[PDB]
Design a binder for these strands. Structure first.
Lengths: 101, 98, 91, 65
RNA sequence: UAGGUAGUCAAGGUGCCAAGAAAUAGCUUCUAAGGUUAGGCUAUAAGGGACCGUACCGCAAACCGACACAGGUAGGUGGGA
RNA sequence: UUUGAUGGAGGUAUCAGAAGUGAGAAUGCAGGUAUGAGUAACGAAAAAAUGGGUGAGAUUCCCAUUCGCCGAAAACCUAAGGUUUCCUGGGUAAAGGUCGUCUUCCCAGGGUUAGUCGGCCCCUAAGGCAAAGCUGAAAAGUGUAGUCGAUGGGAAACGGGUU
RNA sequence: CUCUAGUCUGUUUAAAAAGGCAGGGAUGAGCUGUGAAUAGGAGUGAAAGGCUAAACAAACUCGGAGAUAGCUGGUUCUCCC
RNA sequence: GGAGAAGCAAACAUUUAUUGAUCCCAAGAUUACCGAAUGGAGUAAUCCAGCUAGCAAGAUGCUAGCUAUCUAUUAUUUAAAUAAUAGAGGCGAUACCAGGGGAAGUGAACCAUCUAAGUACCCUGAGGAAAAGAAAUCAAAGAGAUUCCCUUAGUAGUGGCGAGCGAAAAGGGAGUAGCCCAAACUUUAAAUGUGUCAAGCUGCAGAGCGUUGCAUUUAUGGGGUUGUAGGACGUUUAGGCUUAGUCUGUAAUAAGCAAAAAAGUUACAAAAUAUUUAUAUAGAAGAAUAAUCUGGAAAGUUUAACCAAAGAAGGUGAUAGUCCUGUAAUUUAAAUGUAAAUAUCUUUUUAAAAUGUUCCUGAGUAGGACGAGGCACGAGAAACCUUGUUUGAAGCUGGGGAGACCACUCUCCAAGGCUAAAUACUAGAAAGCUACCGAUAGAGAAGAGUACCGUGAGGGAAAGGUGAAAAGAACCCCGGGAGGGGAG
């Protein structure tokens, strides 16, 4: 559902296998409330991709992490996000310090 | 109903292909609300040729049995019924779009 | 129905009550009610003809003897007016 | 969703006719067997519906030229 | 060629009493209000055929009997000795 | 209530309170599984046999040659009914009283073309409905003019070929 | 084509009334197809207390209804007097 | 509202979206055919048309728009017939309400009176509530409409005086509201009856012999509405005038105009506004944790904080006030619905108290007799109320009631019509609560009135859980597969 994170941001992973590893948000599945972080939660998968019999193979790809497990991380700081109204623009700022994202 | 809501799409089947090759007959899926006269008029307007005659059929809906997520019959579903048209042209006439 | 076309009287449903014994006001020890059954009291409609000189013709109405008595007492036009009906609704 | 939000009534009528051409031809090619963009059918159908409302609004006078 | 059945002629013919559908349809015919190319009729060439059903089983494992059931299911064909 | 093994996320001491509070039986209810027992049966005393082929697999499927059965049928064509069961290709969880490559079973696609056939329609029988009229606490009941209602009466085609 | 005397099989049956031998009627009070009509205290009945959707000395469904039983059955942990 | 979207679910492709999509709210457009189904018919989703217009119109062609019935009101000699409008038809709510019809299983240890019970059910009507309602009332107290709770009270009575049935007043609360006609006279007429002299008009007079003379019904404006008050008479009055109180001008009152108030909740009716940061149907913002240890995973252990009008509740890889969605306290409305208040507007008063005279004040009604019903009250001395069959009054110097009846006394004014709130109900929509259920439980149904059964009405199941994430077992081996043995 509604969330304050934008595709392309840089986030720090709060919990899971990848403590504190920092990656960019590649995609957001808001039907399941999950997020895909580039080069994080990285799983091995098998694909035949089709029934005809040339070959199948093992590839590596990221799995969707829950939204709650990431947090925006900008200029060496990670914090919650509030939003402000100035210049007729719903902008976003860091609750810890309060800067332009 | 304009002549575009009448003709739905042609049919490319082995039977229709041989019939078209041999006796110059074209088969269409048409709307269920059409009849002989406006099917002929629609053919004329669309392809600029007047058909000698037209024959229409009502194809009944094919029933299927629906099974659960596990899989076992829980009801009877059905396809959509439709109407098929055989169109007869003069031996010199042709339709090119096919 | 068995309905006075003027007043609206209709049949009235009630009981049928047999009684055995002798009433105390006749020296008897009393009366006892027997088996009550269902019954109906019927209006006595009359298919009467009233000749109206006002249009020189007779109109036939279903009225009860009570309504006939009242018409004889007050006059047909006034009675119809009182029961808010008009002669042209008949015919 | 294509942009006709400035067209006049008869221009919209002409657009509707040639779009119905497009839809019929698209159905025919789909049955003949290979059409690269099947969803073009849905797009064209929605366009035609848009035209029908917009014309209707012209006769009804809700949208004035 | 000759023989010849079940149909058909036949809603026939001949007897009998138990005295043997209806129709405003079809066919033919008569006229009122009206019409006098307004038509109706005889032809003649030109084209108009509505809408629905049409697969398959139908003495049976596909209909009716809870069944792939020793049962039931109208009618027309019923070869030869 | 202590300790092992299993389990992988919620429980419990004291006091007080409230009950849908304790099951072995009601020819109890529901589910699972024994027993009889690998026993009775496998649905009519018309009947099968060999070879070849297909296939992982054949008494059962396909083909060939014999034999047997029905033949006022157990043959052929239309109803009443069923509703894809029809044809082609593919498949064997299950269903087929065995087997199965097979099937009326399953999956996908294809297949029903009418001026003359049967309807629709114009007609009425049995009968239904029914303005008016009449009768009834109400719902409604009778009932004429009208309208529906085939198992009947009404314009029109036959032969051959083709998938 | 319609019915079932006699007898046998069947009788946890092939069949919730059939099957094998057979038997009665078979130009008529005959058999049968397709519709329609008569409904529960009512219908119908060449008359058996028969039949009215496999159940009829008063059908079926829902409701009163958790009807009523002096009748039958069942009623769950422990200890002390 | 802001970045994904193509429903409930992804798959696998192919497009849409920052030129603001999907989605949410409001309005509008489209809206096949059936169904009250209503042009006629019919086997509901389909045939048959007529009239007008458009398709080359046309041969059983197509698309549009009308043609059903009933009630009320008028255009008529409301009937016959159309015409004109207005309102109804059916469904929902296996609830509530009013009216009509009305059981039985049972209890009385039988059973018939009685009970169950005016319950079940059926039928006709409506509403947001319905019904009732402003005393011809209660009842021996001096109260003051109706309705719903508390008590009187299981009392008074009633009952094969058996089983059983069973008040109301008083007194204590919730909620509060009272009004409009008929008639009396009189005004504009129409129609129907009837008429040729004083038939009308405040009284002096001239006019005047029919201002239709007067009645009856209809319509219309005034007038008025009750423990006998109200009309006409009696003066003070009568705003002031203009018209006329049969005609003209004078003493003498009415029809219109200044001067005020109430109203769609009854009390006349119909709206339109703006106006209200009122509210309902989308939204906006929304506080304050780091490290460490175990562990696959932390929210947990441990050590320290920080927020709190927010420690309600869910989700997040184990148990989160500070991770997310939210919560507290605030707040968004172009459009639409509903509410108030304001004026617009509408209607009304264009006055009141003052004394007796004739008139009016609800008629087949009150009441009586007979047969029944409702009162707790089963005929009992049986009042009261409703009523079928009959009979039948008084007219304020009157009439009703006060549990047979009569007298005196006391209270009230019927035979006309309206009225919100307190009350009853929730199929449902929104927000919540739980010593309520956790898959044989809870709705029948976590997947359903489906499968299945019956000709039909109708009857009616069963089946939830991989993991934190498919990361759904690449590949190899046995096997026709299935299944298994390795590897991941």
């Amino acid at each position: 559902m509604k969330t304050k994170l934008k595709i392309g941001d840089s986030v720090k992973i709060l919990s899971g296998k990848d403590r504190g590893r920092i990656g960019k948000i590649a995609s957001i599945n808001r039907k399941k409330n999950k997020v895909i972080v580039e080069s994080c939660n990285m799983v091995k998968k098998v694909i035949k991709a089709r029934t005809p019999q040339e070959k199948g193979r093992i590839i590596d790809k990221e799995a969707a992490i829950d939204i709650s497990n990431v947090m925006i991380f900008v200029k060496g700081t990670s914090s919650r996000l509030g939003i402000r109204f100035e210049n007729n623009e719903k902008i976003r700022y860091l609750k810890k310090n309060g800067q332009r994202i | 109903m304009k002549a575009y809501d009448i003709i739905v799409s042609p049919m490319l089947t082995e039977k229709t292909n041989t019939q078209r090759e041999s006796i110059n007959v074209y088969v269409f899926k048409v709307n269920k609300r059409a009849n002989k006269k406006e099917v002929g008029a629609a053919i004329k307007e669309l392809f600029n040729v007047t058909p000698v005659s037209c024959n229409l059929l009502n194809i009944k809906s094919k029933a299927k049995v629906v099974v659960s997520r596990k899989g076992y019959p829980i009801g009877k579903g059905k396809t959509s019924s439709w109407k098929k048209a055989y169109v007869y042209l003069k031996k010199e006439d042709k339709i090119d779009i096919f | 129905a068995r309905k006075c076309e003027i007043t609206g009287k209709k049949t009235m449903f009630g009981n049928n009550v047999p009684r055995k014994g002798l009433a105390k006001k006749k020296g008897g020890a009393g009366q006892h009610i027997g088996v009550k059954t269902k019954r109906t009291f019927k209006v006595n409609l009359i298919n009467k003809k009233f000749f109206i000189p006002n249009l020189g013709r007779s109109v036939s109405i279903k009225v009860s003897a009570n309504a006939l008595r009242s018409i004889s007492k007050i006059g047909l036009d006034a009675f119809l007016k009182k029961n808010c009906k008009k002669i042209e609704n008949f015919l | 969703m294509k942009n006709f939000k400035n067209f006049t009534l008869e221009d919209m009528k002409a657009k509707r006719l040639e779009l119905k051409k497009e839809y019929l031809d698209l159905r025919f090619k789909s049955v003949v067997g290979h059409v690269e963009n099947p969803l073009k059918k849905r797009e064209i159908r929605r366009d035609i519906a848009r035209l029908n409302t917009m014309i209707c609004e012209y006769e009804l006078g809700i949208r004035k030229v």
